[PDB]
Design a protein around this ligand. Sequence first.
Ligand SMILES: Cc1cc2c(cc1C)N(CCC=O)c1c([nH]c(=O)[nH]c1=O)N2C[C@H](O)[C@H](O)[C@H](O)COP(=O)(O)OP(=O)(O)OC[C@H]1O[C@@H](n2cnc3c(N)ncnc32)[C@H](O)[C@@H]1O
Ligand SMILES: NC(=O)c1ccc[n+]([C@@H]2O[C@H](COP(=O)([O-])OP(=O)(O)OC[C@H]3O[C@@H](n4cnc5c(N)ncnc54)[C@H](O)[C@@H]3O)[C@@H](O)[C@H]2O)c1
Ligand SMILES: [Mg+2]
Lengths: 56, 112, 1210
Amino acid sequence: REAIDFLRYYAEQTRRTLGPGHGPLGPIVCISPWNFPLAIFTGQIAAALVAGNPVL
Amino acid sequence: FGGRGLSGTGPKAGGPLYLGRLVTTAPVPPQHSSVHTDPVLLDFAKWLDGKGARAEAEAARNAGSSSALGLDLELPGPVGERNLYTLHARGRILLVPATESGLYHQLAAALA
Amino acid sequence: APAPFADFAPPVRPQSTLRRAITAAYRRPETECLPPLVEAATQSKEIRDAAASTARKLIEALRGKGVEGLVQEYSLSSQEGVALMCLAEALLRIPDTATRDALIRDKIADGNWKSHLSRSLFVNAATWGLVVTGKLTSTVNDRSLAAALTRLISRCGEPVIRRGVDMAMRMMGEQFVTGETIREALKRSKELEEKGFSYSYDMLGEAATTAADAERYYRDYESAIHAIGKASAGRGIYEGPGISIKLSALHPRYSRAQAARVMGELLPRVKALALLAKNYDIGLNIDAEEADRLELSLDLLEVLCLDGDLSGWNGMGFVVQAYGKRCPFVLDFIIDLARRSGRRIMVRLVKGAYWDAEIKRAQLDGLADFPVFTRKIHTDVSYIACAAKLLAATDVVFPQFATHNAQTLAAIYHMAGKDFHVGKYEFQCLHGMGEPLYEEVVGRGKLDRPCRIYAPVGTHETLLAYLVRRLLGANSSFVHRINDPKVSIDELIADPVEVVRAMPVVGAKHDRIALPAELFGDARTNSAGLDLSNEETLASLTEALRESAAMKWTALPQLATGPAAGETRTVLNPGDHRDVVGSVTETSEEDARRAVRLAADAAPDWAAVPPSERAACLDRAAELMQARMPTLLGLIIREAGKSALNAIAEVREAIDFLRYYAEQTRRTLGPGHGPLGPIVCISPWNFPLAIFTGQIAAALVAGNPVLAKPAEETPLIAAEGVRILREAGIPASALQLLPGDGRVGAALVAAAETAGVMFTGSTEVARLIQAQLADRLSPAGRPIPLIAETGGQNAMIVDSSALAEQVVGDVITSAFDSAGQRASALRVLCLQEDVADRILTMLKGALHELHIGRTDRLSVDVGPVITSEAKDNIEKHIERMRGLGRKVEQIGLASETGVGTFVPPTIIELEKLSDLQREVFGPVLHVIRYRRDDLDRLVDDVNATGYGLTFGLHTRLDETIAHVTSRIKAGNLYINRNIIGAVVGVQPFGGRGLSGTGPKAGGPLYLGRLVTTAPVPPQHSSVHTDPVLLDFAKWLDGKGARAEAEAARNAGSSSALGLDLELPGPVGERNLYTLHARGRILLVPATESGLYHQLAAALATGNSVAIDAASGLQASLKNLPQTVGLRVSWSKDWAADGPFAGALVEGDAERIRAVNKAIAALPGPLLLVQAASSGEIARNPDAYCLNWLVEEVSASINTAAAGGNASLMA
Ligand SMILES: Cc1cc2c(cc1C)N(CCC=O)c1c([nH]c(=O)[nH]c1=O)N2C[C@H](O)[C@H](O)[C@H](O)COP(=O)(O)OP(=O)(O)OC[C@H]1O[C@@H](n2cnc3c(N)ncnc32)[C@H](O)[C@@H]1O
Ligand SMILES: NC(=O)c1ccc[n+]([C@@H]2O[C@H](COP(=O)([O-])OP(=O)(O)OC[C@H]3O[C@@H](n4cnc5c(N)ncnc54)[C@H](O)[C@@H]3O)[C@@H](O)[C@H]2O)c1
Ligand SMILES: [Mg+2]
């Protein structure tokens, strides 16, 4: 559920905010832990991606 | 979700400041504003006016308005719970200026 | 010399039987109005079924067929939609289309909009909020809107800006108005006139503030009549277009109080417009306004319809409001006038547009009931009953049924029956709102009944002024309900007549709206006022006032043993020294000293009267004053020079004090709250009944016998107040009256048995009393309590978002009401530079519409100043300012003022606030200008006077409200209203610094100062703990001072710092009461433990401290945490380190007396000093009472200022 919520929340925050002047950083390295191995994994990656950054 | 000190850097995961850290120019998050103006910022702006530092005084007034310090929101959630989100001062900011004008701008940002 | 009150308020004309029937219904109970309306509105079962079918068909058409689509297309939030429309509004203020488009493409869309657009973008965001969300907010969250505008532009750029511009252009040019100018409106009317509609044009003028404004509205109406009549081209008054006017647009003093000027000056103007309408044969309709203008407008209608120069024309029209209780009786009068004159009067029946404001005004004025219904369904029944009356008289009047309610329409359609011809009656609707409904009505293919469109005409500026009232789509509104999908058609076609008929109590008042008498519920009974627009009231008051002037009023030294002999002199009317009001016998200094001794002897007997019974005496005195109000008014008018309106409000305030302190007593006082003993009450001339009564009632009900020393100028009303309190049961030994001057006051203050002094008056005299009390201690060895409520230097700050007409009304009232002889009066008006010229022009024009004279005439706005000495003092200030080159504006006084002591209302333009150095207690307004960036420095300048009584702010912007109210230091704040007339228990009154010691009169801390152990007031607590107090308690625990750390934590809990309450009051206002820190407290300790207890008390209440360095206790505060150190200073020279806001002293009796003398000698404000011995600190945790270490702040916010009351819309 938390992974789903991260995806939908960062999607909605993107629709509310991001425009052509909010340029991406570039490649983002997302390093995640074993204790939320889907939710924190997905949350970091989803945020970086939807902000316009490719992810490792 | 997220904290301060040894608990991390912020911004909070699952919160409205998160995406702004992942772009080179941050947007204005939804509902991110405050009608409160820091009183020490106001005193600093008047001091700058007295010195004739008109550009810096203007920057200080603008920082005072655009600061969201004092934001106090209730977030939608389940019944039987009240879920609050607030923006407070961070603490003591390390300022590393090079020029007098840069120092005045950094001070305005921190005070605001 | 004119006889007193012989010309008080004569009516325009003798009241006919029909006119008296109107006045009799003004405030008739709602349960009495409805039954005859239900009877008149009843129709046959066949008709009701037919009407429901017709209404269903119309509503089905309406549901089966703008900004919403824009919000959807760009996924805008509500705040983004509002911000976008404010931006579009600002861009449309750029006249040239090409430069606007370049600003959008090259500067607005590409980034910073703030750089390119003295006035907030968001000044009208309350209006656009209504457009976008359907909900009204009184003030604008301009920081939220700025954030949303930046967000939406950065997200969507130029396209969303262009769409917003096009949307706002359509709405403001085509939807909210028919056209920007009358020519444009006339061009756009051809389309629907070809479909069977007609038009009535509204030039959006109302509420003239100045003669120049009234002349502007006149020439605007005249030019419109020419354009409409040229276009009418002989179509006549039924097929062709007409005009609608508001009488308040045509004269700046359109009121019953100025009836003579209205008939002399306003009437000829309306006649001239009507003559032009007659020559073109168009309709001219008089719109209906507030309830207190209804009957006045009938006098103009009567003269116009009887004027032979207007004969031959049937175009005169007149609105009647069905939400008003007088409506059927007004219609009887109009129908009869139409018969007598032979004029077929055009009668527009509306429901009514001022509902919120009428509820608020009746509550504020303490009147018997409302002049409008309180349930919407009652207005609907009234409308239908009045339509039946009008449909029975179509041979003599032309009924015009203005409504958008399809059920109301259908009921009238079938009520009117089958016979119809154009000219028999018509329907009416509002442009851009009723055409969907009436496109189903007009024409042979529909119901074949005509409809006249009410068409607003004006620029964007004019449109936005009163657009909020027009939108109030409330909640019970048909237009709101037709759009609500949760509302079925069956609900929409419900018959209000049958619903009212079947309710348990027909006509019951709305459950959630308080009658004025019940504003405070079970706590106490509100005082009742008098309606000076009611002819029955004016006629009764005329006689009661004349009778009061025939009385041989006297004031005598009324000792416990009986009246005493003394020097006797007359009391003269300050408006005319030929008018002798009465005689005063003044008190010898020997008898004043004797009075205190008798009070001390009688003190045990009065203290033994149980608190509940003492409060019963106060309630009985309140009943007596309410009953005697007309006579008390007359005395106040003639002795103190007050207008009738102000005298009513003063007697109300006296009644309110009596009932408030009685209730506070019943809530708090018990056996352990022992009286102080004899209390000397010294009162000023300017509220000679209310402040006089307030101080005495508080002291008496707290269990103290009282020596009452009234101002030497106003002894008669004081003697009458004492007579009333004694009649109510106050024993003669408990309340003694000592008339005379300050020497009598001084002898009372100096008397050995005086246990407390309550003073209201000048700061200079209070300082003399403080110096005399500094020599004295109570038998217990504590300072003699002094409550001293003194002057003000009160400011109002106005920014470019405020509404100039609102500002000018509140400034004229605040500065010149009572000839500026209120402690609360506005002394310094501060105008933002970009609106200062326009507001100042309006203010000067309004100044010259004031009537100055002897106050036994209702038409007088401003009376005299109290004495020749006061007049000389005030005029000396004016001439000094004039001698310095400052611009001075003064109205010219009539020769009749020569027999009294008058100062003309005066406006003085200053360069800096420091040009003004002392309170000038008269009708003298000072004006300064400021740049918006210097607002914070301006607030500094206001605080820098050292005063802190009343303060006003006019702004619509939340950021400015938050800033200014957080930085101003004053006891009574007012937002978007005037700054005078604080109400007992609603705006508890009193300030800080040079303005007083506190506690506030009419507030919950007052009685506790008048007993030796203060009670816990109602609602007096706080869950907040001062964080520096907590740091200090931890520091104490670290130092091993465990008992003191415990006492510090207890102080932190016991403190009520942070209390934040809303007090009950009228609708349309929010009245807040809060407890703050006082400031910097002077600490004068003797021992280490004493210092820790003093510091704990001060920090727990949010204060900083200056500690007496001569105590030698510096080593007791080694290594304080920095948070506490920030609050602590050491003072060798107390006078150099002030002003302080209070003091805490430790020592024996001789030490306390010596410190008290040194504190009294400090410059500036009187300090509330608390003293205790070291032993008392050890024994009594409350040795220093936290009640006196916080500062009370009252704030009153006019939440109807945006044009309506959102809470009442539900
Ligand atoms: C259509 C129209 C309206 C008005 C005027 C002309 C025309 C053609 N006219 C001039 C325009 C304004 O200056 C006018 C109006 N009102 C007024 O006081 N003086 C005037 O000269 N006009 C407005 C009119 O009174 C009314 O406000 C509206 O048309 C709305 O009424 P409508 O009948 O279309 O809607 P309903 O929803 O069935 O009724 C709403 C009205 O009901 C009353 N109300 C609301 N709450 C109430 C409570 N709690 N108690 C009692 N009455 C209540 C109000 O009167 C509300 O307006
Ligand atoms: N803060 C408030 O609530 C409030 C309300 C009304 C008026 N005021 C102030 O009152 C002033 C005007 O009223 P006023 O002209 O009657 O005030 P004042 O100071 O001239 O006299 C007030 C009373 O003090 C008495 N008095 C004069 N000298 C005295 C002395 N040496 N010892 C004892 N008593 C003495 C007078 O007889 C009078 O009864 C204004 O400064 C106004 O601001 C304050
Ligand atoms: Mg005096």
